[PDB]
Structure formats: structure tokens, C-alpha cells
Amino acid sequence: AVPFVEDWDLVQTLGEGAYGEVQLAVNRVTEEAVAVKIVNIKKEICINKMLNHENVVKFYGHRREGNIQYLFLEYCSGGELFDRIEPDIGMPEPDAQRFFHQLMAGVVYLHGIGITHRDIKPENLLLDERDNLKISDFGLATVFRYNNRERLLNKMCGTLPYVAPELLKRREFHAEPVDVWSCGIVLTAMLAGELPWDQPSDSCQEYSDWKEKKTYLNPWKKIDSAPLALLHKILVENPSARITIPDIKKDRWYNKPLKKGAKRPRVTS
Numbered sequence: 001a002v003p004f005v006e007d008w009d010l011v012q013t014l015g016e017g018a019y020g021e022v023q024l025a026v027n028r029v030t031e032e033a034v035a036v037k038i039v040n041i042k043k044e045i046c047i048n049k050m051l052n053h054e055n056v057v058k059f060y061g062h063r064r065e066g067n068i069q070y071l072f073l074e075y076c077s078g079g080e081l082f083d084r085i086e087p088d089i090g091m092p093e094p095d096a097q098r099f100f101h102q103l104m105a106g107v108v109y110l111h112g113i114g115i116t117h118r119d120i121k122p123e124n125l126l127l128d129e130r131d132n133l134k135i136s137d138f139g140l141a142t143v144f145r146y147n148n149r150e151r152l153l154n155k156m157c158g159t160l161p162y163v164a165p166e167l168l169k170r171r172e173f174h175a176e177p178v179d180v181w182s183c184g185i186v187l188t189a190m191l192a193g194e195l196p197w198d199q200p201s202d203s204c205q206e207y208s209d210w211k212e213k214k215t216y217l218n219p220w221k222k223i224d225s226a227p228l229a230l231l232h233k234i235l236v237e238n239p240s241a242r243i244t245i246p247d248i249k250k251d252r253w254y255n256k257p258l259k260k261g262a263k264r265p266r267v268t269s
């Protein structure tokens, strides 16, 4: 229709991953911003075409140019959740709760359509212009439910400090408690500004201390009793005993009023 509307200028590097790079693209005509992932890949596109939710990075389409694959994705101007976490501090509890609510909304959605992300961490949770959280990077994602039949997972996927202990100890495991666990590690990072362990193994002193309930130690001593009680339900070694998302939604801290709405303009007299 309108000339030049299909032209995008690649203006800045957003990250240089394993596959390739992510560029910020700006439309020559409209100045609309999109993230272009320049490159597992066939599955990532297939999974992305299934996604439509306010807390999931939108997929606009893809184009193949010989050996190069281009994925046009929602640009999140707020960057990574990772950058909002102050090292050894975390962030204000109300901000962490709001991001946690948004993360649960995204995960409920994905699980509802039978998709597991398998690599939830603050580097993959992006923020838009209004600080709304969006789950990104479906490179490691997979279908765990098809035709209402659950498929047990067996592939070692994810990032060690975020990974659930059953991935390291069992041949097969249910997909959903694995994503719930990584969400608990994200919550810990938001509230304490540190990861509790290198990996959830009995060989990890920090992991053993957590199972022994030594909450007078870091990162736990920095976390208020209400969010810490939720973490005691999420970070449970037995995935069958671990809290499910419907129950996280019933948690006392999850439902605690803490955060005021966005700073809206106001005047007096």
C-alpha cells in the first residue's frame, strides 16, 4: 500500500546470544520499534506462532534469507528484569510482587496452552515502556501437553541456579513444577539481590542449609516472613509436594496489598 512501510533500520544491539544477535529495528516510515532476532529455530518459530498474551513477548513473523533467519518480536524498551535487581539488595517488595503477579499470569497462560518455557530467569523477563513484564526467548521451550495428554520431560534444559532439583536427580519429570521452581528463584533474586545456590544439589552447602530451614542465613534473612513463607512452598524438593500455580494465587503474600498504581498526574485546590 504505502511505499517504504516494509523497511526497517537496525539501530542498536540488544544482545549477542548463542544463536546470533538481537537488534532493535525501527520502521523507516512509522518509527515503530521491533526486536529482530537474527539467527531449535524451527521449534522457536512454531512455538512463537501459538503465543498471544500481554505477559509474553509478541511474535510478528519471520523471514528466511538463505542461511539467515529473522524473527520479528515485540520490543520491550524497559530492558531486562535482571537490570532492576540491585546486587545484594533486590528491589522494593511492592515492585517484586507486581512483577511476580505478571510472571504468574504469563506462566499460567503458557501452561494453559501446554507450553513450558524451561528457562525462566531475569535475563529472559523483559519490561515494556510501562514496566509490564513479558516472558521472552522460546528457544528452549517445548510442548508438554498435546490432545489433553501430558508428556513427561527428560531433556536437561535451563540454567543451573534456576533449575529444579528433579532435573538433576530423576530420569523423567513433569514440566509445570520445573517452571514454578524457576519462578521461585526469580522471586528470591528480586527480594534479596542474590541467587541462593549454584545448583539445587545436596553437594551445595547453601541448598542443604535451605532444606534444613536455616533462614537466619542469606539470602533468606533479607526476605520478609510473608514472601519467605511463599518461597518455603515453592522451593520444595519433591515436585509432587511443590505448590502449584492455582495455590500460589491463594498465597497470603501473593494477595497482600503493597503497591500503589502508576504515578498518574494530579493537582490541588
Ligand SMILES: O=C(CN1CCN(c2ccnc(Nc3ncc(-c4cccnc4)s3)c2)CC1)N1CCOCC1
Pocket (backbone or CB within 6 Å): 014, 015, 022, 035, 037, 057, 073, 074, 075, 076, 077, 078, 079, 080, 126, 136, 137
Ligand atoms: O536506557 C536504559 C535501559 N535500556 C537498557 C537496554 N535495553 C534493552 C536491552 C536489551 N533488550 C531490550 N529489549 C528487548 N525487547 C525484546 C527483546 C527480545 C530478545 C530476544 C527474544 N525476544 C525478544 S530484547 C532492551 C533498553 C533499555 N538504561 C538506563 C539505565 O542505565 C542503563 C541503561
